[PDB]
């Protein structure tokens, strides 16, 4: 019976708290994977900065020859 009374108390406390404190709350939207997707996107950005750099012809303004 003690467990049941504890459950009742918890439920009433939660209801009171929400009514007098918490703000707007989303119903359910398949709670974002962002908690680990932060590190996943950190690795993804490490991949993104690893994009291939195209080769280029090095400029060199040389002088004249010889005669």
């Amino acid at each position: 019976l003690d467990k049941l009374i504890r459950v009742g108390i918890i439920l009433v406390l939660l209801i009171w708290g929400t009514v007098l404190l918490l703000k707007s709350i989303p119903h359910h939207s398949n709670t974002p994977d962002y908690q680990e997707p932060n590190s996943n996107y950190t690795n993804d950005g490490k991949l993104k900065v690893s994009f291939s750099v195209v080769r280029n012809n090095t400029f060199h303004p040389k002088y004249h020859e010889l005669h």
């Binding site: 009374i5 504890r6 459950v7 009742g8 404190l21 703000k23 709670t31 974002p32």
Partner: protein, 488 residues
């Protein structure tokens, strides 16, 4: 009743959750709604009337396909029940600042003596000034019972052991209490049956001598077919405008009340399912039917919370965010729990698991057991109550436990158990403060993100209890119910 609603609620679930809904399903589901009504002592002709009333209210023959059938089929029966229980005449409500006198009538053993105390205590709690009048001279020791119940309810009362005429004592009690400007004056009348003409005329004599503002007839829920004959006869003589149903815990579940409503065209103001005075519940029309369909009242619970009317909500929030949870705050929360009213009604009004979950056998004394918590905590001084954490200070000087046990009983194990509960609540509050921004005030963060709400939901689901979270509806169900409390 908490049993008819389940049967009726299961009948609506039989109609739903089906790959198809034709004209055969309706009848099939209507049979379950009829059998339940028959078990509720309602007349078979009336049942055959509700079945025909819902049949014409929802015709699938030429029903515009594309419109929610189940939605308008479950609402067709909800209106039927409500109508079946609503008389259609507005009830009488006493006015502020005016002396309102209510006279109670009923049969012997209906509970009029307890009904007086229940109504008086309800009005006193709501803030009304009330007094009691005992005009019973036939039942042996009726005045003694009324006197002991009144002094238990700290409500003024009047009476006399030697006076035999109820008319003079009732009239003089009303005259005495009108001098001091009492607002509500309820007069207790002795039991009476229509077969006895002497008390029948005594009722008219006392009614003319007192001239009550409203006449209330007390009807037990355990009576059978004999209710209509006495009710109509009583109404034919005195101006009965409202009735009260008692003994709701009985097996007969007050099946004749529907026929009584159909006869007198008057509503029921309150219902009492317990012998104790504190067991007193309203009989609001729409919420009672909404309970039967698993659509529990939300307006009533928020109205009760508004009646709780917490003084401040800003300093408490900043205290919670910093992780402080003191003993005095816990004592105040317990005081709000006690002032919240009956514990069964709190979870009865939710659309959750159901209303037949709070058993009167054990939780009634469990509330009195919880009452010992304030007794234990009243031995704490200002330093302990305002301390940041009671476990740390209580772990340093054991003599404070002895001092607490001085004021209270043994409490050697009770104080330790209370400290464990306080430690668990303190850790819960620390986690709630560590959610980092789920509360109002401060910044203009009116909308809460789904990630922080998901973290809070995970934290909440891990500490309440098993076997109640699964049937609650899961994370989605809990969040949807919290949103319902938000909008509602």
């Amino acid at each position: 009743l908490a049993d008819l609603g389940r049967k009726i609620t299961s009948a609506l679930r039989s109609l739903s959750n089906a790959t198809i809904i034709n004209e055969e399903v309706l009848n099939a589901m209507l049979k379950e709604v009829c059998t339940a009504l028959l078990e509720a002592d309602v007349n078979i002709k009336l049942v055959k009337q509700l079945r025909e009333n819902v049949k014409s209210a929802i015709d699938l023959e030429e029903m515009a396909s594309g419109l929610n059938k189940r939605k308008m089929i479950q609402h067709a029966v909800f209106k039927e029940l409500v109508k079946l229980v609503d008389p259609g005449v507005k009830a009488w409500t006493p006015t502020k600042g005016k002396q309102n006198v209510i006279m109670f009538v009923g049969l012997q053993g209906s509970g009029k003596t307890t009904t007086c105390s229940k109504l008086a205590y309800y009005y006193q709690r709501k803030g009304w000034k009330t007094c009691l009048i005992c005009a019973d001279t036939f039942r042996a020791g009726a005045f003694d019972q009324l006197k002991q119940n009144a002094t238990k309810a700290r409500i003024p009362f009047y009476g006399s052991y030697t006076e035999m005429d109820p008319v003079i004592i009732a009239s003089e009690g009303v005259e005495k209490f009108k001098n001091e400007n009492f607002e509500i004056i309820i007069v207790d009348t002795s039991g009476r049956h229509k077969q006895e003409d002497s008390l029948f005329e005594e009722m008219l004599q006392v009614a003319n001598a007192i001239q009550p503002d409203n006449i209330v007839y007390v009807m037990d829920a355990s009576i059978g077919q004999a209710c209509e004959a006495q009710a109509k006869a009583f109404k034919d003589k005195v101006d009965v405008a409202s009735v009260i149903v008692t003994k709701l815990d009985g097996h007969a579940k007050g099946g004749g009340a529907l026929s009584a409503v159909a006869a007198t065209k008057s509503p029921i103001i309150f219902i009492g399912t317990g012998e104790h005075i504190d067991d007193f519940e309203p009989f609001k029309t729409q919420p009672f039917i909404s309970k039967l369909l698993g659509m529990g009242d939300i307006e009533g619970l928020i109205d009760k919370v508004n009646e709780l009317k917490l003084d401040d909500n800003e300093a408490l929030i900043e205290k919670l965010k910093h992780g402080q949870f003191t003993l005095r705050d816990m004592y105040e929360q317990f005081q709000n729990i006690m002032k919240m009213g009956p514990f069964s009604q709190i979870l009865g009004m939710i659309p959750g698991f159901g209303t037949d979950f709070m058993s009167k056998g054990n939780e009634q004394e469990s509330m009195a057991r919880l009452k010992k918590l304030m007794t234990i905590m009243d031995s704490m001084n200002d330093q302990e109550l305002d301390s940041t954490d009671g476990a740390k200070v209580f772990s340093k000087q054991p003599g404070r436990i002895q001092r607490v046990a001085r004021g209270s009983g043994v409490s050697t194990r009770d104080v330790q158990e209370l400290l464990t509960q306080y430690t668990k609540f303190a850790q819960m509050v620390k986690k709630m403060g560590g959610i980092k921004g789920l509360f109002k005030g401060g910044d203009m963060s009116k909308n809460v993100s789904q990630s922080q709400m998901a973290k809070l939901n995970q934290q909440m689901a891990k500490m309440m209890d098993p076997r109640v979270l699964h049937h609650m509806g899961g994370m989605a169900g809990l969040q949807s119910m919290m949103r319902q409390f938000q909008q509602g």
